[PDB]
Symmetry: D2
Subunit: 399 residues, 4 copies
């Protein structure tokens, strides 16, 4: 064969069988996504060669019948620590990878919450890529990381699929690899009996950039004013809750700080309350985005609400909202998205979605699966416009 995923298999082979199985269950889809997103052949080789060298060893064992790994990830249905997502606009689509980098003692007494593998991966990316900055990672790792004893405590109070402290995404954008990370607040909250709100904002307010940037301190107090009445004041894990803190692994003055809420209830009034920050945002841009989100939910794991802030900007923007799609028929989802894209006037996206979906996941019949689409994120930005993020359980789509 002569497609890049095939050529790279032929050129590089595999250090071990797990890496080979990961390639066999993901690289073909990845090359198809890249192709369908109009990445050049040179960028397809770039990202697939990157994937081979850096990501395959980070994915740990390939969970399969008869081989049960010590560490089970909540990123996918089968426990595989990988997702592939697309960020769609009217005119372009970006591919992103989401993973946990699995350490070799992950899920055992010497590393109960997989505390080390992501930062090792990011260390290797820092020597690969000139623009990668580890200072925000390190800052939040210091604030919400746990020692081994604490990690062992947390594993006693959390389901197997939530034994995590961090996870990593890689945006494959502008011919670069752009890393970002999310940190879990729940283990520290549980182990220290600290309110999740308190620890989130304590960690944020100790950032060097917070100390240097008045506009960020302005946006953050507004967010605190919105969130304080809505999340617990005590130490319980009662949604709605501040469950993740996200940063970009770039210059801290350029990084978006993300505060992610998880909740199990989402009805119209809450979508409204989240999206407008309780009536704080009432401008036409926010309201057009709201219409979009209400329409999506009508046309169609916790819900996600992600508030993203940037140094230099004092005003909050509407969040990105995440809908879990696990349990919903994938062909139905496809047909609903086609409708939604037509509603948005993204005609070319509507005309190609379903056929391109089948071509991403040729081993599976999408009319009969319910776990291939895992999440959908919807956003509206004053400057970039509407976008949709679709997260796929790539392993479910290949096995």
């Amino acid at each position: 064969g002569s497609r890049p995923w095939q050529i790279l298999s032929q050129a590089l082979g595999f250090p071990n069988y797990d890496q080979e199985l990961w390639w066999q269950n993901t690289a073909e889809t990845l090359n198809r996504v890249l192709e369908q997103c109009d990445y050049s052949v040179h960028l397809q080789y770039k990202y697939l060669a990157f994937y081979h060298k850096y990501i395959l060893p980070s994915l740990g064992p390939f969970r399969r019948p008869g081989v049960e790994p010590e560490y089970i990830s909540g990123l996918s249905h089968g426990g595989h620590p990988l997702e592939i997502s697309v960020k769609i606009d009217k005119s372009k689509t970006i591919c992103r990878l989401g993973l946990q980098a699995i350490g070799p003692l992950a899920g055992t007494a010497r590393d109960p919450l997989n505390s080390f593998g992501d930062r090792e991966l990011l260390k290797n990316l820092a020597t690969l890529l000139p623009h990668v900055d580890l200072r925000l990672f390190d800052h939040f790792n210091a604030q919400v990381g746990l020692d081994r004893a604490q990690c062992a405590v947390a594993t006693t109070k959390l389901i197997k699929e939530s034994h995590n402290i961090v996870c990593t995404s890689l945006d494959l954008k502008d011919g670069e690899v752009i890393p970002k990370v999310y940190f879990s607040t729940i283990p520290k909250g549980l182990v220290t009996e600290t309110p999740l709100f308190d620890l989130t904002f304590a960690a944020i307010e100790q950032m060097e950039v917070y100390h240097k940037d008045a506009p960020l301190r302005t946006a953050l107090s507004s967010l605190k004013d919105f969130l304080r009445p809505r999340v617990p004041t005590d130490a319980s894990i009662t949604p709605p809750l501040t469950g993740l803190i996200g940063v970009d692994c770039i210059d801290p003055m350029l990084s978006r700080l993300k505060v992610y809420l998880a909740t199990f209830r989402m009805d119209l009034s809450l979508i409204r309350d989240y999206w407008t920050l309780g009536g704080l945002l009432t401008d036409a841009g926010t309201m057009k985005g709201l219409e979009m989100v209400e329409t999506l939910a009508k046309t169609l794991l916790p819900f996600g609400i992600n508030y993203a802030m940037k140094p230099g900007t004092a005003e909050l923007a509407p969040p990105q909202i995440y809908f879990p799609l696990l349990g919903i028929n994938d062909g139905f989802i496809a047909d609903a998205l086609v409708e939604f894209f037509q509603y948005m006037g993204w005609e070319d996206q509507a005309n190609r979605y379903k056929d391109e979906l089948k071509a991403k996941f040729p081993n599976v019949d999408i009319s009969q699966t319910k776990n291939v689409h895992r999440w959908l994120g919807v956003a509206y930005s004053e400057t970039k416009g509407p976008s949709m993020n679709i997260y796929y359980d790539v392993v479910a789509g290949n096995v």
Copy 2:
């Protein structure tokens, strides 16, 4: 041979020649120091095996004639990223290793200040040892580390032996390995054109434990009041200066925070000023330590060091540890001086064995002829623990 260093060579061999050379110029001395400090044979194997597995690969290429590494360390005279030290009390002597963990791209464009190797080692120590903790490492790495472009700027403003941000020490204490790290403030100060005093305290004041611990804040407040009129208010790298921030890689509530001053000027009057915090400390214990330190200086190039160590839950400053620079002074003279100081302290047994044991620690060089083997001598007095002496050796200088 059947000594532990030899047995482990025979059992383990070496992955590459540089590691073999490191072992050949350090492992015998380390085994000797361990023996001399009355470590059991089982602990000697524990530490030498640990050294072989964890430390040898972290030391990088062995700088030698015809082979010049990309990365040159300031830890030793020959550019080797290694020191061995002993801390001597009344009751016992502890051995400690000091290194920089050299990344494989260190001192090139992809890693100009060797920014990654020490954290890599510490990660490996965290799955090895159950009480190793990375949170203070990570905090100070966030606050005084630099991105690649900044690291590149810093190499244009620093001599080649100062292209570093962190180094690591490992106390071989009880039967454990206890890691500590020290972060340099100079690269960030130079790149951001920020006074060293300001960026040092800015980084400390953002610690989680600073926010939780009134006693630590109070101690730090007293230290700032002492330091502010003595160290530069401008961005200059001139003495005395706040050059390093030390932490123990343990539960941050138990970690000592160390602020290390470097300076070239020292006389009995400055000894008193540092030791007593300009008259703040006046008690019997402080004045007794002061007398000891004065006597050492009388009995006796790199800067002097002054290390102020603070613990969460302690509100008051104690006197610092004072480090005497010994590079360039003949090592036989130093051994005679130490024998004298030991007798002055009443440490007869230490006085009577110091010279013979020195010879025996460095059998492949005549230590009476060298001037680089003793690098530093630190002296401290604790109300709790009594007086102690830290002797730091350039092990490679004592072996090549």
Copy 3:
């Protein structure tokens, strides 16, 4: 804990969980065997450190409930590629390790018969140990190894526990590590449809040392004359058969060449036929060994083994080593039988300690309840060295 196996765990930790599990189910027993054989503490550290560094990564995944490796070994009952043996004389007891070095793609399409891992280990042993020699390994790898397509054919004609071409033993003798290997003739016989006898002797007769050494050729000629009417002339895999070729990984002029027969039928008459080479050997030493072997059999599923060992510069065959298969027979009964045989041999001290030491070697299982821990018992008599007994243990079966 302060025993060497514990100290090395504490010093070294583990690269991954499988290695940790291997250490947790084998290292205590190995330390016990070493102690029991009167190895000094320095040798105990030497061998345990060697085991940790070289052997743990070679053992592959630790087969356990919920985790089924791609490659299953025939060396043990649970599929683990490991055995520990002791060779007991009048004067002393030597410990030996037996393993297959598992490649990372072993038992998949890219490496169906685990064809690479053992040579990789041996390469690492050659830079570790100065008297390790790869030439006979390489010779037999050339003559009875198979390419990938052939290896794939062989997996269709063999049970999963027999997907192998080579295995390795390491004698822990004097203060050294002495490697030996054994090559299987079965895969090549099956794939090429060639009689095992023919391909075994073809491979031997192409040795450089065969061409240089008349005495070896003469010995081999006598062995062929004995074997030819007893083993199949056709291509069948039926007993008695020439199933393994053993060599020592040393100077080929000093290496013993071993031809190992497997067979299921054994009674006193066949014992005599094997031991005396069908009446060829009639001397006092041979008949005395014969009596010993007969008594063992009376005192006492896997095939019997018969191992004919030949040395360059020796023209005459000596009696073989005979291996009794013990899998499935209760281990407390075996211990009682061995005590009886030891008393018969006059080895009182061995008789008096066998059972207590067995218990102590396998402290996490009750060896009186098991039937898989003793796997093999080999017995030999040398004119030169006297009688000896090799006991092979499924260490993992004695620990899980």
Copy 4:
């Protein structure tokens, strides 16, 4: 940049600085050679990704001012264990890599003759490539390899650049990687005081394939009849001598066995004696090849003569002859080859040689270098026709 060598640098980075320097001094030229030989872009990525993963770590340290490695290779002027060669016909050109794979203790007491690194590389290729066969390697490694003590002896009697037992070539042909190896007879001859002739033929006559193939035994006795009067009968290292044994790492029934003579004298009468095997080959094909070789030498380290035999074939063919080009001006060499290609009627090769040469080695002025062309090999085959092999010191052409 977007050329494959650049893309792969961006995607993969480097495990260490030596590997980065090797890439910086060879990968650009390699991509240019591949390009100039009309390899597709997919094969350029195949071979460059292979190069990165398998060959860079095998090349050991990058010898440079201030960094003197323990092991110095005789493959190049600067001591670098690498060459890049092209095999030219009238219609196509094949690129090949020649190296020694450098072990981490090479040239020190634990590995005095670099005895291990090639077989480790070949082990990794055997899991990469289905067609790679290690049985001939192992056979000859057993016959001419030395133990450590013996290796240490040999290093006392041989120059630093001849402390070798094996070397490896990789033909980049038909979208595959095809390995072949040469083994050095000199260390064993020196250490055992055995005649080189005796040990060469002893090793060959112990091959399993020799025992199975009458035609090969027929060709080999003819070669012995030719060589016995011409090389030493005693154990001295007096050229002409049988100095290398070459095999292909493939099915032993398909492998060409090569017996390489080294000599320091080459005049017309010897070229004649070698090429015709002493008057044994007098057919028109042999004689047309002879004309070619005589013309080449007129138009333009020991000389090389390589006799290659294949199982199933009883008759010998003319050897390939190797001319060392070290010390001769590279622009002169270029202009001479241009003339030679015109004499052969390879007009298109003549018209492109010099410009393509400069483009392979843009960092150097070929009119002023004398070490870029290291060797030239000339062959004539009954079935494939004439061919020329040109061996470049790629590091000399880049530094």
